[PDB]
C-alpha cells in the first residue's frame, strides 16, 4: 500500500542506537497506529541500507520498488535491491510521440503504400533525432516498429527509397550509440532477441533498396552502410568493402574489410551488394556466459540477393588487447548465438585478424 521509509540520526553507535530503537519500536508503532492504519508485521528497523540511491531510495536485500516514468514517457520503472545496487529489471518507459506514432501505424498496416511507409520512417527519424535518449522502452519500441515496417515492406514488396534508407540508418546510429549498451543490456534481459531483431531488420530492409537508387553510402559514427549496383565490373575486380571507425577509447582506428574475389561472381551477377558495419553491435549481440570469450571486432554484414558465395575474406581489427585465441564467427539468427560453422581463421597479425567463411 504505502511503504514509508525514514531514517533516524543519532550520536551513539550503530549497535547501541539500533538496540535502543527496537526496545521502543512497539511504542513508536502504537503512536503511528493512532494516526494511520498499519499492516501487521510491517514495522522493520535496520541499520544498513544495502541499496541507497536518489532515483529509487533505500531498501534491504531483495526489496523491489516499481516507480512511474517521467514527462513525455509512458510506462513504469522496476528495480530490485541486490548486492550491487538497484538493478532495473523492467523498464517500459516509452516516449509518447514514439508510442503515438506506433499507434497510427496499426491503422496503416491494412492499406499501406510505398509512399506511406517512407513518410512514416521519416516521422520516426525526426522523433528520435529530436529526442535522442535511448531508454530501454524506446529501444524495444524502435526495434519493434522498424521490424513491423520491414515485415510490412517485405510482405508487400515495397521499395526503400534512398532518402528512406538514410532515415533508417539515422535511426540505427541513434540507437547504436555507445551510451546505449547498458540499457541494451537491460532490454536483452527481457527481450533476448531485440538486438538480433534490429540486425535482421536492418539486413531485410537493405535488400529492398533497388539498383536504381545505388550507389549509396551512409557513413555515420556508430554504423556504416554502403550499397552499390552490380555491372560487368564485378566480374573483374571482385567486391571490396572497407571501414575506418575511430572510437573514443582507442587512438587507433578499428578497421574492417570484406574481400570477395572476382571468381565468386562467375555465375549470373545479382543486382545489389549491400554491406554495413558497426562497433556497438559487438557489445549488444549476446555471447555465451559460460565462455570467457567476447566480441573483439567490428560486426560486419554483407547481403547479396539470390546469390550464394562460397568464399569470402574478412579482416577484423582487434579492439581490446591481452586477448588470445581468435574465433571467426557469424551471428546465427535461427539459434540466436554466435556460430563458427563455415568460418575458419586464416592468420592473426599483431593488429588485425583474418577470417575466411564459406558462406555470405
Amino acid at each position: 500500500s504505502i511503504v514509508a521509509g525514514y531514517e533516524v540520526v543519532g550520536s551513539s553507535s550503530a549497535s547501541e542506537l539500533l538496540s535502543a530503537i527496537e526496545h521502543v519500536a512497539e511504542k513508536a508503532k502504537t503512536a503511528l497506529h493512532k494516526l494511520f492504519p498499519l499492516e501487521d508485521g510491517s514495522f522493520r528497523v535496520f541499520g544498513k541500507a544495502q541499496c541507497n540511491d536518489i532515483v529509487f531510495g533505500f531498501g534491504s536485500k531483495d526489496d523491489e520498488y516499481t516507480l512511474p516514468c517521467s514527462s513525455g514517457y509512458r510506462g513504469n520503472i522496476t528495480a530490485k535491491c541486490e548486492s550491487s545496487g538497484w538493478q532495473v529489471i523492467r523498464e517500459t518507459c516509452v516516449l509518447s510521440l514514439l508510442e503515438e506514432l506506433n499507434k497510427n501505424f496499426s491503422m496503416i498496416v491494412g492499406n499501406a503504400t510505398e509512399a506511406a511507409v517512407s513518410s512514416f520512417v521519416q516521422n520516426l527519424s525526426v522523433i528520435i533525432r529530436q529526442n535522442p535518449s535511448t531508454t530501454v522502452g524506446n529501444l524495444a519500441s524502435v526495434v519493434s516498429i522498424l521490424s513491423n515496417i520491414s515485415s510490412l515492406s517485405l510482405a508487400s514488396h515495397f521499395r526503400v527509397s534512398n532518402s528512406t534508407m538514410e532515415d533508417v540508418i539515422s535511426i540505427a546510429d541513434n540507437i547504436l550509440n555507445s551510451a546505449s549498451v547498458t540499457n541494451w543490456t537491460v532490454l536483452l534481459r527481457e527481450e533476448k532477441y531485440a538486438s538480433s531483431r534490429l540486425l535482421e531488420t536492418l539486413e531485410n530492409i537493405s535488400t529492398l533498396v533497388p539498383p536504381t537508387a545505388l550507389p549509396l553510402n551512409f557513413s555515420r559514427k556508430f554504423i556504416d552502410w554502403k550499397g552499390i549496383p552490380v555491372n560487368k565490373s564485378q566480374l573483374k575486380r571482385g567486391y571490396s568493402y572497407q571501414i575506418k571507425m575511430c572510437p573514443q577509447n582507442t587512438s587507433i582506428p578499428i578497421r574492417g574489410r570484406v574481400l570477395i574475389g572476382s571468381d565468386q561472381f562467375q555465375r549470373s551477377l545479382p543486382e545489389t551488394i549491400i554491406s554495413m558495419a558497426s562497433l556497438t553491435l559487438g557489445n549488444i549481440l549476446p555471447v555465451s556466459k559460460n565462455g570467457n570469450a567476447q566480441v573483439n571486432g567490428p560486426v560486419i554484414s554483407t547481403v547479396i540477393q539470390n546469390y550464394s558465395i562460397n568464399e569470402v575474406f574478412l579482416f577484423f581489427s582487434k579492439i581490446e588487447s591481452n586477448l588470445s585465441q581468435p574465433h571467426c564467427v557469424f551471428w546465427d539468427f535461427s539459434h540466436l548465438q554466435w556460430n563458427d560453422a563455415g568460418c575458419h581463421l586464416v592468420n592473426e597479425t599483431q593488429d588485425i585478424v583474418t577470417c575466411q567463411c564459406t558462406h555470405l
Binding site: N292, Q294, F316, C328, W338, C357
Partner: peptide, 13 residues
C-alpha cells in the same frame, strides 16, 4: 550474414 571474431583471455597452466 553478419560476421565478427571472438577472443578469450590467456589462462595459464
Amino acid at each position: 550474414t553478419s560476421f565478427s571474431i571472438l577472443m578469450s583471455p590467456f589462462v595459464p597452466s
